Ligand binder design. Sequence first.
Ligand code: GTP
Ligand code: GTP
Ligand code: GDP
Ligand code: GDP
Ligand code: MG
Ligand code: MG
Lengths: 426, 426, 163, 426, 426
Amino acid sequence: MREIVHIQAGQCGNQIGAKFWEVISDEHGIDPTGSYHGDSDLQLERINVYYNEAAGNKYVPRAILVDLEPGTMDSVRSGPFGQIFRPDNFVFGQSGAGNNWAKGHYTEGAELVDSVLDVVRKESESCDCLQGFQLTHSLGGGTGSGMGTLLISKIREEYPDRIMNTFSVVPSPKVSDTVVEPYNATLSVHQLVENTDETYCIDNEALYDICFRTLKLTTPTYGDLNHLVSATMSGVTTCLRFPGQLNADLRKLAVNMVPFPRLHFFMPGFAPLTSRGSQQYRALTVPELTQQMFDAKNMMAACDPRHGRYLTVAAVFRGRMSMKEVDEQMLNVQNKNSSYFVEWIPNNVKTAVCDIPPRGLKMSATFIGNSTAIQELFKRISEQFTAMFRRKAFLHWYTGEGMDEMEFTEAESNMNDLVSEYQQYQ
Amino acid sequence: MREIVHIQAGQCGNQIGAKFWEVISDEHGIDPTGSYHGDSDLQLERINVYYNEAAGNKYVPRAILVDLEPGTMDSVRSGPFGQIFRPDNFVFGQSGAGNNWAKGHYTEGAELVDSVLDVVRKESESCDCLQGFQLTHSLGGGTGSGMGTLLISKIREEYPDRIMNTFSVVPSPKVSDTVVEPYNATLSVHQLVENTDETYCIDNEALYDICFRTLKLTTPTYGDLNHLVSATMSGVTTCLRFPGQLNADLRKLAVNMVPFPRLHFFMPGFAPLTSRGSQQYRALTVPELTQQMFDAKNMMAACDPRHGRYLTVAAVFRGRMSMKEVDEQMLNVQNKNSSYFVEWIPNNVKTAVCDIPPRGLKMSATFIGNSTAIQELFKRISEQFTAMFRRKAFLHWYTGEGMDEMEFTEAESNMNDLVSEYQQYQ
Amino acid sequence: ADKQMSVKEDLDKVEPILESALAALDTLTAQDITVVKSMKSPPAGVKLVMEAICILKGIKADKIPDPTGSGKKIEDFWGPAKRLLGDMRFLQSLHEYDKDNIPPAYMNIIRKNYIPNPDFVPEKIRNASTAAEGLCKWVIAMDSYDKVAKIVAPLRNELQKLE
Amino acid sequence: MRECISIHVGQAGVQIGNACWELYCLEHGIQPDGQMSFNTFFSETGAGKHVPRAVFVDLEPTVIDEVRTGTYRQLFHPEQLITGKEDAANNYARGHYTIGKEIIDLVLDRIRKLADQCTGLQGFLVFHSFGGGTGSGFTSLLMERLSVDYGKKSKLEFSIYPAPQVSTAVVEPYNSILTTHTTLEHSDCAFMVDNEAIYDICRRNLDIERPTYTNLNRLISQIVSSITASLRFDGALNVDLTEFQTNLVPYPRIHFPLATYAPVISAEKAYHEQLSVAEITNACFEPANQMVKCDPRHGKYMACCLLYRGDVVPKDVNAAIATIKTKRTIQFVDWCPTGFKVGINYQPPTVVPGGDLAKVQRAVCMLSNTTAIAEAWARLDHKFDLMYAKRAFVHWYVGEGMEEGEFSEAREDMAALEKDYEEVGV
Amino acid sequence: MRECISIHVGQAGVQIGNACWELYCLEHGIQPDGQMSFNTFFSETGAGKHVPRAVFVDLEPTVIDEVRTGTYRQLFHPEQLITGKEDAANNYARGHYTIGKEIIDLVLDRIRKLADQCTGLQGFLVFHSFGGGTGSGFTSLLMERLSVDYGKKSKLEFSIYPAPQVSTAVVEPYNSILTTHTTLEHSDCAFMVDNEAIYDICRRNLDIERPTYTNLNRLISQIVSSITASLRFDGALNVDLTEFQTNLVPYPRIHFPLATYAPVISAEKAYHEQLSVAEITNACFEPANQMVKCDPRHGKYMACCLLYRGDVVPKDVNAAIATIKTKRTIQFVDWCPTGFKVGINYQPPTVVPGGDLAKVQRAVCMLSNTTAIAEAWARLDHKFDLMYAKRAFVHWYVGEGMEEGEFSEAREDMAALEKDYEEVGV
Ligand SMILES: Nc1nc2c(ncn2[C@@H]2O[C@H](COP(=O)(O)OP(=O)(O)OP(=O)(O)O)[C@@H](O)[C@H]2O)c(=O)[nH]1
Ligand SMILES: Nc1nc2c(ncn2[C@@H]2O[C@H](COP(=O)(O)OP(=O)(O)OP(=O)(O)O)[C@@H](O)[C@H]2O)c(=O)[nH]1
Ligand SMILES: Nc1nc2c(ncn2[C@@H]2O[C@H](COP(=O)(O)OP(=O)(O)O)[C@@H](O)[C@H]2O)c(=O)[nH]1
Ligand SMILES: Nc1nc2c(ncn2[C@@H]2O[C@H](COP(=O)(O)OP(=O)(O)O)[C@@H](O)[C@H]2O)c(=O)[nH]1
Ligand SMILES: [Mg+2]
Ligand SMILES: [Mg+2]
């Protein structure tokens, strides 16, 4: 029971999703042909969540692939794990959003949504009991922002009682990649704040930091960055998919992580983040993992944590460990970082222990933090956006698609509202 | 017992019939030579319905082939399955109807009918117990409309107590093929309404839709369209020909499907409609099949179902399934389509479960719907016709054959009568 | 002119109830409403209140698929409510709603039962949900304002004729 | 000896028969070959073989053809298996007036021959369906004939009643009502089971997720076996067919007892159970375990009978009954204080190879009249009223030797019945 | 006989159950198979395989799924194990109002069935957690239902209380308080153990550096075994469930005894020890050995009870108690002079293979009510006040069928409780 409906929108969404599926496949013993060849019974105990099995032990993800262009999703198909996806999943048009929110939401993507929603409906009724919808969609692109956001809205109208979680890849102010990245992000966020229960905000900057420093990969492939995010999402959903000493449902995490309706944004991490052959100087222990997780170098978000205080924390560990050890370990942690844990909430941390390791690490962990500090990320984008709006810049592309200045002003208001609330609960 | 006398009239009738016979042959284990080489005893348990046996295990369809021209029926002969017919069963003249109703009914076909009726009489007397007459005849042609309709009338006079069912291929307003298609259809329908118990209305448009979208054949051969209709008719008559958990006679279907004398027109479908390798992504279940059947893409009629409400429904499934599953499944369906099931009749659906699959699909289904929506099909043709009658167009071809304006007015009245009745029971 | 001033005094007497409707619009909190609505099945009182909002909006209750027990399809107004609330600009839409543009049908539904109900009365709603206070107030105040448009608007038009 | 006659009518009847005669054989110890005091249901042949004292009728030869090829084939003497030309096609007017008044006389012949065999002809059992075409008119016709012939003899009616929700056939509602008009004034007793309730029982208590007709049928058949075994076997308190009639019919008009067989227990549910005598009594009185879609609490049990089998000791039974009387919930009628008869038979039920049930040492078929069945009557009256407002499918019936006025009178009768039950409840 | 019911609710409850039913089996001599007077906790089934008189409920199916595959599997009834769709996700408003008022009725059914088995139903044991989602609302709901049903019957509550320091879940504080509101006015007695104190006991007395949930649980379970064994076994001074209620609850409202099992002694600590009767008494009264994070010296032992097992001779016990009374440090409440009951049971505790403890000939579970638990109440009231100042996570609960006012009233109740304890101390 409690099955999840995956979604991948935009090149970024589509590629992280690509690597994401591959990752979980290996975790559940599924090979490229959609056949099971795993020695762990526990994999197929709850295969349900992430895979719909058919005739002859074919195993197929509950995943919908959306791209306003054909190309990136055709690369998907060519890919090794691409064959496990269905054509039913591959739903595309042939007009590119071209990093325009208005193309994604209003125009090109409004034409392609109904078809996608039909596939959504196919995938909802095929569920024993639908739990949630995971959407991997960039904030700063065209097919992630507009098309992604539109998809979220309609889906929430259809199934309002269910979980909507989005591992949304956000702009990094220091490494901007696109023109109107500010425009895309701001318009996206305005909608996202109101349309999702939880959003895991991952910027490329932080990923690079991790790769360079810790994993010691000074040639990051998008593959490597993707591999990172993939493992993050796996960890989030391990509990549903495997037995545990304490088991955290997606709703459980949300409920434990959220002081208020609005402030649902999070920073995921992972441990152990080490290079190959940089594990022999180490020894895998609960303290080790916690220390790694609570370090700034192992945050997959823009904000430095220490520029604020974690409102809440939820550390979903994996592999075979003493609850006592974890308890005792994360009590110390509460005490040490007195400055960086919010007062409002005692027992800031929330520890969930899945009994399954990630097939090759004897222990592992996955952080989820809600920090007041992430206000800084929003500030950066607000600033970037604001300056360009002062010159009414790039306006013509958006006004061309029906969008209005007042909308943008309202999107700015949304951003302002988000940052003030964090300040209040600093 | 309960044997059926097939008929094929006009190129269209003759060709669907061609493919139809081939289809059933394979279902009953009969090869091109009229010899049985099947491993299923059940095939020859009720071979009767559709074949006469003679000396040396002869297998002869009780089918009469009619064409006012020799050519299409000579192609039949040349064909692989063509040589299964007893050559005495091809009754032809050498003057083409040339898409003239008046040539088919009044003139050229009145000359060739008596000979055909003699062959009809042969067949009726060779029956252990005649059940019905299946006529595959186009509405919009010359040899289907006039000649077909004339054949129906005389046969009904001869055997009024028996079943007359006609898988009549109708005009598609969006893909007109012939000049006076309106004229042919309107004159045909006028007669058909009063002369048949049940008529399965199949337009080429819908077939194309199926092929293109679902079967993913973007090169439809008339072969493929024909293969479709063929399977439809097989499904209709599976019950008579094979044992079942609940068995629906042709009369049974008619009786279950018809609220009133007149509104006997139907829309057939089929499932599972999938492309090769497309099937893959599906997994054959009762719910799957029902969902496919009740989808608009798997309707072999012009009308969108949702532009109206099904008066009645009769889903004749095939292969080995749980009556409970079907029952429970189609109860949900009643609930889901609250707006597209007519109130008058509770238990709108009628489930019949044949115990025989169609030799290569573990499960299968065949829909028969009576929708108020099909009024739209009649409207389109009425409109098309009416405009041309306003200019008294093409009149000379028909007046030349003895036909009169008043007749046409009366045919218009027939059409009007058909559409009003559906409106009343909307 | 004095007659005009008298109708404008009528309005001044009515201005607080118009102000009450405005205050109801205001009492629509940022995202507490947004979340009480995000949650599936809040206190029935608030479910009545959002049903009242649905009627206010003019959106009709749908039919729940009939259970085995009962042939009749259950009358459900919460699903319309679910979609109505779901709208991102729903709160904005409440702010946009006009007293003049109120179905008299809605007043019939709401005033009679919902306006004089004890659970629907703000005190119980204050208990029921802090977020719902606004919503209940909104429905009540909207009805009072359509009570008020119905009585003062034709009078003001008659006054305009006098003017 | 006390000896009986079986009459399976319609597809439903015959299918149940297929199941029934399996059971009896397994119990009495007869092989399908007929080779081995069973007097009641087997008449011994010349040597070795035993022949079922049964009648097998269907207008649809399809059904009984399956009989003729089954392993249950040589068990019957094809004196029994009667065939008709064409099926009643869910028309009551074909079952009664047309195809009935043709083959009925042949059936009356076989009946009479079988009657002559019986030294002590006890009575009859008539497996039909209120809502098949065959069993709706034909059954009534047959009943009428037998009443004229015998009158005094015992007549029983295992009637597959329409499930208020579950859908088989569109005209189903008309058929039931016409059957009731005619049946209630012939059959002294009528145990009515609907499929939906049986399906409920299949899913819940036996944990079976695919309820086939076969399994549902075995359950139906075991209900009879218990009714019989008092005749078929020794033991304390043995009941007779006449005894039910006498017991269960305080008012000569109302005789529609519900049945319910417990325990309904799978291979698992064997263990983690104690199968005690009093356990099984409670189970029988359960609102869910009823074989109709009726809640017994929505009225009063008027008279009840319980037919314990296997290792049942009367003292155990008497205490359970005390308990039952104690519970105020389970309402009884004011005017009859003790509304039970208890029959204890040393023979336990013996369960069919490849089936639902496991070895239950104790079992009990409770045949209980209630005023609560008046709910299922009302529902069906309503379904009929709705369609007969429109006068739908009127044409089929009328043209087959029926009266429109017959439909009106039938309802009147139903109103009277309902009124009677209301009186009784008061 | 005196016979009992087990109810494991929530993940915590079920885990404890997993441990509990192991122990009982090892004691009574039952295998996991169910094969071998244990009347109290095993109901000897017909087939044999003595099966527990237990109920196992969780909304999170994950937990009980682990049960269904464990070696402890064929021990439990199919009925024993009940599943829900989705987990309460640390919401009291989902445990009580939503998913509770759905599956509760099914559970009430199983309870009632089990109730019927018991000749002499003694009472109930309810393993839940004040601070899980399931066990916080659902438990309260269940309790309420059972109070309405039985009332007079005995109800016991092994409540995993929040450790003031140790962290599991963020909303944990809210849950406890809502539970208390409802629980205290149903459960006549509530033995509350927090994990932190148990962990302390694990580290110090057993020298275990990795306290897993399993080990903590075995300790929790042995506390019960002693409470029961007076029912389960022979011996002088045997106590009953009702006896605790009566003896330990002079004031009806205050029924929160602490527990403490000694000796808590490893394989080593067996030697370097002689385990005398009076040694073990002192150990029980130890401030550190308490199973709660409460210092007993910070108030007065209101009432005490001691449940010696194995080779205990009363004279030994009486002298130890004299000694204890002598010590002026260990304070007792004014109202009662002699605040002990002593139960001596000839059965010694028998320890679980692969576990903490070694063969202790003598053991004693002291269930001792003190005013000192008012410290742990205050702490938790404070935690709640802090978060409810902010009104944090208010949204989750409200939207799930709750009252904000319920939170206020709950505190009021707590204030009253605390005041009562203060009065008692005075
Ligand atoms: N238990 C059971 N009921 C059946 C079975 N087949 C049909 N029914 C019921 O019978 C009714 C449907 O009509 P049938 O009984 O098949 O019809 P018939 O009496 O054979 O009449 P014709 O088909 O016209 O010859 C409904 O009440 C069905 O649920 C079966 O195998 N088992
Ligand atoms: N002794 C013990 N306590 C546990 C265990 N698991 C959880 N707990 C305690 O239970 C509370 C945490 O919530 P759970 O009991 O897991 O939650 P639940 O009752 O299953 O509710 P849901 O998870 O929402 O279904 C805290 O008090 C934990 O310390 C366990 O295995 N043993
Ligand atoms: N982590 C990650 N980010 C990517 C990848 N590909 C593109 N992106 C980011 O996506 C952002 C642009 O949005 P994109 O979704 O490509 O626009 P679209 O193609 O129009 O949807 C850039 O900031 C890229 O850094 C990838 O494989 N991994
Ligand atoms: N489905 C189908 N339709 C056909 C085929 N051949 C012709 N038709 C249709 O038949 C219609 C014309 O009638 P036709 O019977 O050919 O006229 P005739 O040759 O004078 O009888 C056209 O609308 C064609 O689409 C075929 O093989 N399959
Ligand atoms: Mg039949
Ligand atoms: Mg849980």
